[PDB]
C-alpha cells in the first residue's frame, strides 16, 4: 500500500485497512443486497429529490474516478425524505465501473454485479459543511444508481463527450448547466442501510439509498469511461477501470426496502 491508495494488486481494497483501520469496521460499504432478506418498511417515506435549481461547476479526474461538482453553498439541489431526517445538499456525483460489462458496481443485488454505479453524494446541512458532516454517523446520504449496458442514456451524453478533456489525474474542465435529473431512473423505489464511504477515509457517516431500478447506458458510453487514466500526464498509462470496492460484511445491519 505505497501509498496514494488505489485499486491495483499492491494498493487495492485489501490493503486499505493499513492506513484506514476502519476498513474492518462495523458499518462498511458497499454490501450485497440480499433481496429476500431485505425487509419492506411501510414506515419509510417517499424519497424527495429536488434538483431543479442544481448548479454544476466543474468536472474533474481525481485519480480514482471522475466527478461533477456542484455549488452547495445554498439549498439548490437537495435530498430529503425517505430514511432521512432533515435536508441533504448535493455536493458531487461520480461513478465506479469495470473493465468488462459484468463487473463495475460496488453494491451487488443477490450477488449480481452491474457494469457501473453512479453515486450522488449529499451532506446533512445541520452540520454546516461536508468536512464536519463526514465526522457524524448521519452526516452524508449517498444516492446509488446501477448502470447496465443496453440503450444509450441521453442525459449522460454531455458527460461522456467531455471526458477526453480530463483524461489524466488532476485535469478538470468547466461543466456548467448540467442537469443531474437526466441520470435518474423512472422509479425511486430503494433499499437503505447505514454504511460508509467506499473509498478512503472509509468514514462511517453514510446513509445509503440504493435505487432498485438501473439506468441503461450504451456500450459506447461506458467505453468512454474506460478510456480515462488513473495516471497523471506523462506517466505510464494505466486505464481507469475496475475502480470499485467489493462487498463488505453486513455484520449487525438490516437493509430496509421502500417497496413491497
Ligand atoms: N463512494 S462514495 O462513498 O459515494 O463517495 C466517496 C467519497 C468521494 N468519492 S470520490 O470523490 O470518488 C473519492 O473521494 C476522495 C476521498 O474521500 C478521493 O481521495 C478520491 O480521489 C476519490 O476519487 C468517493
Ligand atoms: Zn462512490
- Is the CB of residue 186 less than 8 Å from the CB of residue 119? no
For residue 86, the domain's CATH number is 3.10.200.10
Distances (CA, A) of 229 to 87, 171, 218, 246: 35, 11, 20, 21
Q: What angle do CA 205, 123, 147 make, to 5 degrees?
A: 85
CB neighbours of 227 closer than 8 A, spacing ≥ 6? 163, 164, 167, 239
First to last CA, the chain: 43
- Is the CB of residue 95 less than 8 Å from the CB of residue 196? no
Single out the residue of 93, 80, 72 nearest to residue 50, CA to CA: 80
Residue with cell 461533477: 68
Experiment type: X-ray
Residue 170: CA count within 13 A, CB half-sphere: 5
The b/e string for 94-130 (b: 16+ C-beta within 10 A; e otherwise) is bbbbbeebebbbbbbbeeebbbbbbbbbbbbbebeeb
Strand partners, 43: none
Tell me whether residue 125 is annotated as binding. Answer: no
Range of the domain at 233: 1-260
Tell me whether residue 96 is annotated as binding. Answer: yes
Distances (CA, A) of 198 to 2, 16, 36, 65, 170: 19, 11, 24, 12, 20
SS (H, E, C) the chain: CCCCCCCCCCCCCCCHHHCCHHHHCCCCCCCEECCCCCEECCCCCCEEEECCCCCEEEEEECCCCEEEEECCCCCCCEEEECCCCCCEEEEEEEEEECCCCCCCCCCEECCECCCEEEEEEEEEHHHCCHHHHCCCCCCEEEEEEEEEECCCCHHHHHHHHHHHHHCCCCCEEECCCCCHHHHCCCCCCEEEEEECCCCCCCCCCEEEEEECCCEEECHHHHHHHCCCECCCCCCCCCECCCCCCCCCCCCCCCCEECCC
- Which residue among 11, 22, 94 has the greatest number of ligand 1 atoms within 8 angstroms of its CB, and so is best to mutate? 94
Single out the residue of 210, 217, 221 nearest to residue 247, CA to CA: 210
Distances (CA, A) of 89 to 44, 51, 123, 130, 175: 20, 10, 5, 9, 19
Single out the residue of 219, 238, 251, 241 nearest to residue 65, CA to CA: 241
Instruction: Kindly give the distance from the C-alpha atom of residue 42 to the centroid of ligand 1, in angstroms, as a whole number.
Output: 32
Kindly state if the Cβ of 107 falls inside 6 Å of ligand 1: no
Q: Which atom of ligand 1 is nearest to the CA of 206?
A: 3
Decide the pairing of beta strands 172-174 and 206-211. Answer: unpaired
Residue with cell 473493465: 99
Neighbours of 53 (CB within 10 A): 11
State the total domains in the chain.
Answer: 1
Distances (CA, A) of 90 to 51, 133, 187: 9, 13, 20
Distances (CA, A) of 48 to 78, 80, 82, 177, 181: 8, 5, 7, 21, 12
CA-CA-CA-CA torsion for 73, 74, 76, 78, nearest 10 degrees?
Answer: 90
Kindly state if the Cβ of 62 falls inside 6 Å of ligand 1: yes
CB neighbours of 92 closer than 8 A, spacing ≥ 6? 67, 68, 69, 70, 120, 121
Residue with cell 467506499: 198
Q: Known catalytic residues?
A: 64
29 alpha carbon, closest ligand: 1
> In angstroms, rounded to a whole number, what is the distance separating the alpha carbons of residues 98 and 146?
12
- Is the CB of residue 255 less than 8 Å from the CB of residue 195? no
Amino acid at each position: 500500500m505505497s501509498h496514494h491508495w488505489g485499486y491495483g494488486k499492491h494498493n487495492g481494497p485489501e490493503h486499505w485497512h493499513k492506513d484506514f483501520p476502519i476498513a474492518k469496521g462495523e458499518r462498511q460499504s458497499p454490501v450485497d443486497i440480499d433481496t429476500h432478506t431485505a425487509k419492506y418498511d411501510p414506515s419509510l417515506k417517499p424519497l424527495s429529490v429536488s434538483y431543479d435549481q442544481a448548479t454544476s461547476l466543474r468536472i474533474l479526474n481525481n485519480g480514482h474516478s471522475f466527478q461533477v461538482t456542484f455549488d452547495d453553498s445554498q439549498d439548490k439541489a437537495v435530498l430529503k425524505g425517505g430514511p432521512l431526517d432533515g435536508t441533504y445538499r448535493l455536493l458531487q456525483f461520480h461513478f465506479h465501473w469495470g473493465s468488462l460489462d459484468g463487473q463495475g458496481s460496488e453494491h451487488t443485488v443477490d450477488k449480481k454485479k452491474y457494469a457501473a454505479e453512479l453515486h450522488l453524494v449529499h451532506w446533512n446541512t445541520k452540520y454546516g459543511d461536508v468536512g464536519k458532516a463526514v465526522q457524524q454517523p448521519d452526516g452524508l446520504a449517498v444516492l446509488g444508481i446501477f448502470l447496465k449496458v443496453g440503450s444509450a442514456k441521453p442525459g449522460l451524453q454531455k458527460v461522456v463527450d467531455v471526458l477526453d478533456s480530463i483524461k489524466t489525474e488532476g485535469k478538470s474542465a468547466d461543466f456548467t448547466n448540467f442537469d443531474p435529473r437526466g441520470l435518474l431512473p423512472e422509479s425511486l423505489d430503494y433499499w437503505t442501510y447505514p454504511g460508509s464511504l467506499t473509498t478512503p477515509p472509509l468514514a462511517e457517516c453514510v446513509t445509503w439509498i440504493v435505487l432498485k431500478e438501473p439506468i441503461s447506458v450504451s456500450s459506447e458510453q461506458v467505453l468512454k469511461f474506460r478510456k480515462l487514466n488513473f495516471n497523471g500526464e506523462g506517466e505510464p498509462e494505466e486505464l481507469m477501470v475496475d475502480n470499485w470496492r467489493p462487498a463488505q460484511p453486513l455484520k449487525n445491519r438490516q437493509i430496509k426496502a421502500s417497496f413491497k
